[PDB]
Structures are given as structure tokens and as C-alpha cells.
Design an enzyme around this catalytic site. Sequence first.
Site, PDB file in Angstrom:
ATOM      1  N   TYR B 139       0.625  -1.353   0.058  1.00  0.00           N
ATOM      2  CA  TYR B 139      -0.063   0.063   0.092  1.00  0.00           C
ATOM      3  C   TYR B 139       0.817   1.242   0.069  1.00  0.00           C
ATOM      4  O   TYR B 139       0.667   2.291  -0.544  1.00  0.00           O
ATOM      5  CB  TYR B 139      -0.938   0.059   1.291  1.00  0.00           C
ATOM      6  CG  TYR B 139      -2.061  -0.886   1.183  1.00  0.00           C
ATOM      7  CD1 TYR B 139      -2.606  -1.254   2.462  1.00  0.00           C
ATOM      8  CD2 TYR B 139      -2.322  -1.485   0.045  1.00  0.00           C
ATOM      9  CE1 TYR B 139      -3.865  -2.292   2.235  1.00  0.00           C
ATOM     10  CE2 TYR B 139      -3.662  -2.505  -0.012  1.00  0.00           C
ATOM     11  CZ  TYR B 139      -4.358  -2.823   1.262  1.00  0.00           C
ATOM     12  OH  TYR B 139      -5.272  -3.629   1.044  1.00  0.00           O
ATOM     13  N   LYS B 185       3.460 -15.563   2.338  1.00  0.00           N
ATOM     14  CA  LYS B 185       3.330 -16.167   1.081  1.00  0.00           C
ATOM     15  C   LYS B 185       4.846 -16.561   0.680  1.00  0.00           C
ATOM     16  O   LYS B 185       5.201 -16.430  -0.237  1.00  0.00           O
ATOM     17  CB  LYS B 185       2.936 -15.093   0.082  1.00  0.00           C
ATOM     18  CG  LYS B 185       2.335 -15.793  -1.343  1.00  0.00           C
ATOM     19  CD  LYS B 185       1.123 -16.357  -0.952  1.00  0.00           C
ATOM     20  CE  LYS B 185       0.510 -17.602  -2.124  1.00  0.00           C
ATOM     21  NZ  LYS B 185       1.286 -18.938  -2.203  1.00  0.00           N
ATOM     22  N   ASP B 217      -3.525 -18.257   1.211  1.00  0.00           N
ATOM     23  CA  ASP B 217      -4.303 -18.812   0.300  1.00  0.00           C
ATOM     24  C   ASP B 217      -5.171 -19.817   1.332  1.00  0.00           C
ATOM     25  O   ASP B 217      -6.086 -20.272   1.065  1.00  0.00           O
ATOM     26  CB  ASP B 217      -3.693 -19.135  -1.075  1.00  0.00           C
ATOM     27  CG  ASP B 217      -2.440 -19.841  -0.918  1.00  0.00           C
ATOM     28  OD1 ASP B 217      -1.538 -19.153  -0.711  1.00  0.00           O
ATOM     29  OD2 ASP B 217      -2.409 -21.252  -1.229  1.00  0.00           O
ATOM     30  N   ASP B 245     -11.911  -8.722   6.290  1.00  0.00           N
ATOM     31  CA  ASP B 245     -13.048  -8.780   5.545  1.00  0.00           C
ATOM     32  C   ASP B 245     -13.530 -10.075   5.770  1.00  0.00           C
ATOM     33  O   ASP B 245     -14.861 -10.033   5.998  1.00  0.00           O
ATOM     34  CB  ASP B 245     -12.803  -8.082   4.003  1.00  0.00           C
ATOM     35  CG  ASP B 245     -12.924  -6.762   4.258  1.00  0.00           C
ATOM     36  OD1 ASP B 245     -12.311  -6.026   4.980  1.00  0.00           O
ATOM     37  OD2 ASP B 245     -13.162  -6.029   3.144  1.00  0.00           O
TER      38      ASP B 245
END
Lengths: 345, 345
Positions: B139, B185, B217, B245
Site C-alpha cells: 500500500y 506467502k 491462500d 474482511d
Amino acid sequence: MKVAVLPGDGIGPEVTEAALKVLRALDEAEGLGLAYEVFPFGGAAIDAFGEPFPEPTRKGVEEAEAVLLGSVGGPKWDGLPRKIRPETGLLSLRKSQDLFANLRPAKVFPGLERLSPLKEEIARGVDVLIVRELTGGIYFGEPRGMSEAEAWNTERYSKPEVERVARVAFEFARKRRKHVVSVDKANVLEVGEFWRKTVEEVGRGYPDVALEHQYVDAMAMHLVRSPARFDVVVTGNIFGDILSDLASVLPGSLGLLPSASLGRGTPVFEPVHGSAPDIAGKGIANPTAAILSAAMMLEHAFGLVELARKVEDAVAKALLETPPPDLGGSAGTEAFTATVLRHLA
Amino acid sequence: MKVAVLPGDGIGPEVTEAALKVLRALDEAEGLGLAYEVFPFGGAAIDAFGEPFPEPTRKGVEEAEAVLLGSVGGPKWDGLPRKIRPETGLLSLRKSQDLFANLRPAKVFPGLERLSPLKEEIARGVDVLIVRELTGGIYFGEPRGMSEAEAWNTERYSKPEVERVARVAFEFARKRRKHVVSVDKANVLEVGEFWRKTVEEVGRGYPDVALEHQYVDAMAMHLVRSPARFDVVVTGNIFGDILSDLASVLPGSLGLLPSASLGRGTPVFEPVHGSAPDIAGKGIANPTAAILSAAMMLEHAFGLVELARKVEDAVAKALLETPPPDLGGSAGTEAFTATVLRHLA
């Protein structure tokens, strides 16, 4: 229809065989003119050619009109150098045929709602198709690296990379329910805005398809709160990876999940499940994924939509009549496949 | 108990006031020594000082012991250049107080399992806390940008950034069920390797806390199939956005969730929901998220754990008895806060 069959390792062989019993039945019944050949791939290939994707197999793929792949991997070939591990054989498969889109369906078959982690009302009717971009993204972006003080990777996408994958999405929504949802993060990342804009540009060529955009984080919870309103979902490499795995938990078992990697060359259809080496040869493997991957092959590679659907309904009937061990039943590979065939004649 | 209140825009003042009614009620009943001042923030401050985080507001947050924030944003200011936009006020607030860890609790209150999209069996007993890295990642990574044929963003993480957030994660693990799951990851990204490594390292100082690693994932699958097995989940900025979320579905809705931003300065407690400007002033807005943020403040900023739990239960009763409109009911802000207040006696 010339098919290249790459069973692979573990349960790959027995599930791929199950699919083949279905194809032959279909072939004999209507004279589809099916011609297939089996080639060594993955561990089976290493154990004879020293490499997971030998030349004979490599050609078999190029010559065929579609590839029905099984499973790859196993503890035996886990000490080998990365360059020759079974998994790398798959990368070589993808890169040779330049497969850039990975289709990952998630369908909750009527009667099986009880398998989903979601309440029946929510699971009822799920039939989403996640289309992930394989070749580019932060997984391959340069620059990248790490030192003792920090690490960095780069999420990069070019216009052409985003366009070709978007085309596959719009193309499939048309065969389906004309709806596409492009998932990005345009509210914070430049790549997000560039992705969104490019999808909108490709979208003009498909005025018959309803396009919508969503933020990855928003799409995550949407897939869990109301996945029945989605048809085709298209997204980048890393996001698609997260979302595909998220969608796969919806049906309620991995044995039910098929997949396809489309690109420039020969289409590759294969079940999502791994090689499951400790149950290999026991005859309990669930052939559904493989059979369903065969159906995707019939429809998408050979345009036999009507035929693909039959296989799909037969399989659904079978799952209800004689569910395999992973669904709480007793139907081993053979008996289960028999039930499917008992619905194709 | 000196609190700085920044209502913000849209329903912010509405929801913040419902929250203040609870805090004041606890104050009189327990003699907390509550003192609060409201300050202009967001569009409300832009209108007045031409800046989302004016000087008087900044000093106010610096002298308080905790900040109770409402909402920020609105189209009236969306046309302004980023640098002055309301959303920037939030960044300036976080940076000024060196806030680097966002705490997002996803909890399913007994009786309310019904609200979850998930089967009652799997949503039952869930209490996960996602600790997301605020200042850093893709970000705010450099370089970044886009051209007419490409775009890029940079996921970069340094050792300190990771250590700071990791430390907070283990610390909370201790006050909870002593289990941290680091999400990265690593199997494909250097930053994943770097993150994991750094977390495993920091984990050495916390031998009583059970560390575990998961790829993003895989976590996406786990939070849907078996969310109840998790306690604390520490991860990066974007991964945290997605995971947070997603965790919101478990309880049912995204508008019932609170958050906290910790660091070296004054901690900020704020509802995860937006300002919903169109329902501003109409009553109807659900203050649940604002009240739970006030509950987090009492617990984490003031140690009044028992009091936090007491208001959590009061809203649980209230959500069950007089559900707000967004929960399918018809209890507006005033009527709902009343119910909460009733169970506070």
C-alpha cells in the site's frame, strides 16, 4: 478428438482411468471419434527419463487437441533438485503451451448443499467460475529480493497480460450467465486502477455481458455471504489464488473440483486434488474431479456442450446414489464410476 | 480516563454518541473518572480549517489516553486533491501517533450463530483476532506507478516493521489462548520468507505462545472451514485487509465490527464501517460497531476488562432482542442504544 492423457502420480492413474471409462462409453455410443494416448509425466516420467516432462510427452501435448492430466508429486521425488521435481514438470507444461488463464469452477450440485460449510439456503445454486491470471503478477514481477534488513517484491502487470485474460472471462460469461466481476484493488494500488481500466476497455466488445468491479477484500466476503449471484469472476495472479481456494471450500470437498488452464496452446484439464500417495492403489479415490474435468474438456475443448452436461448430471446422480468414501459413502473408484455409466446409457 | 472523541462524517456523530451514552452510563455507575472532548476530524474539520486533521485536534489526541473515532469520508470532499481529502486525516493521525498495528476482532456471540452465513456448527465459538500491519507493505511501497502500457507496486518490508507488529501479536496471544498463526506467502515471495523468518525469530522470546505458519491462500480456506481453531493471526497490510474482511462474515455482518490501532502513541478505537452519508441524520444507523470500539477501549486502553465484557453482552442481548434495520429489524439508533443501556444495569 485427439486427447493426450497424463495420469501422473498417486491416485492420478486410477482417477484418470475412471474418466476414460466414461469417454469410451460415450465414444462407442455415438462415434465421437475419440483417440487418446497415455504419456509419462511427473514422478512416473522422472523414474524413467530423469525429468518430469520428457520429450515424448512434450510432443504428445503439442500434437493433441486437449490434455487430460491427473496428479503429480510424491515423497519419493521430494529430495531431487527443484529443476526436476514433479511440480516443475507442470510449470514446463504451462509455459510450453503458454497457458495464461486458470479456470477454477465451484459448483454446489443439488442435493449436496449439506456438504458446504454454508447454510443450505446460501449454498443452494452456487455455480461460480474463478478465472485467474497465471503468467504475470507479483509472483513473477521484478525487481524482487531480500537482504538481512529487508525484502521486496513487485506486483507488475502490462496491458497485454490483462487483456488476454479478460477476453477469456468475457468469452466464458457468454457461454454462461453473461455476468463478469473484475476483482482488483483500485482504491489503493496503481495496478488495481490499470487492471480495472483495461477490463472496462475489453468489456466494450461484449455489450451482451454485464460487467462489475469489486475490491479483492470486498469480493472475499461476498464469495462467502452470497456466492450465488456470481457467474464469472476474473482477477490477477495472487488475488485469483486466494479467491480460487476460497471458492473451492464452497462445494464441500476437493474431490468434486475440476479445473482448466487455457492459453495459446493445448488446453489442460485436471482435477484440483493432489496425488494423495497413501491411498493410491487402494481403489477408494473419488473420480469425480477427473470425470468432471473430462466434461469440461468435452464442452470447452470440443464444443460438445450437450454431452458435457449429461456427464455432469450423471455424476450428480451418482454422488447422491452411491457417494464415494470422502462423502461418507462406500463406493470405491470402480463402483462409483459404474453408477455414472449407469446414467449415460 | 481522558478520551479524545473524533466523530467524523456521515453517521460518525450518530454512532459515536450512542457509544458515549454507554461510556457515560458506565462512568456514573462505576466512577471511572471519564473526561472527554470532541474534536473536528475529516470533512467536518476540512470545512472549518481546510484540513482533515487540524492542529487543535492533533494536540487533543496527544493529550488524551485513547481516541474514540467515528467515521470519515463523504462525496462533498471526494473531489478534493488526495493531500487534503478526509481519508488522509486518518493517515496523518496514524503516523503522528506511530500506530503500526490494526486489531480486528471477529467474534461470534452465543445465540447469534444464526446470523452467520456458515453452518451453526462451524461458526459456533469463533473468537479470532487479526493483527494487521498498518504502516507498510504494498500500500505504501516504493517504487510505484503506472503508464499507458504497464503498472507496478512494491511490497517491501523491513525487519523492524515486522518485529513491532509481531511483538504485539505474541503479547495478545498471551492475554488470550496463546496461539499465533503468521500469515505470509513464503513459498513464492521473498517477503513471505522474510516475514516468516522474522516472526519465527521474534517468537523465540515467547516460548509459552504457540506459533504456526500458514500461506494466505490456505488461511482463506481455513477461516471458512474451521475458523474456531484460531486465536491470534498476525499478518501484513493487504493480507490483513482481505483476511479481516473475510472474518467479518463469520459473525454475520461487516457493520458490527470494531477495530483498534496501537503503536507508541495514543491508541485509536474506531468502527470498521464507513460513514454511510445518505442515512446520516435519519436515525437508523447501527451503533453496534461504535459501542464495541468503546468496549475495546475500556479493555485495552484502560484495563477494565470486566466492563468491556459487560457491554459486549449487552449489545449481544440487544442484537438479539431489538435488531437494527441492517440486521433485518427496525430498531433505530436511539431505540437500539436504549436496549443496550437496559442490559447495562
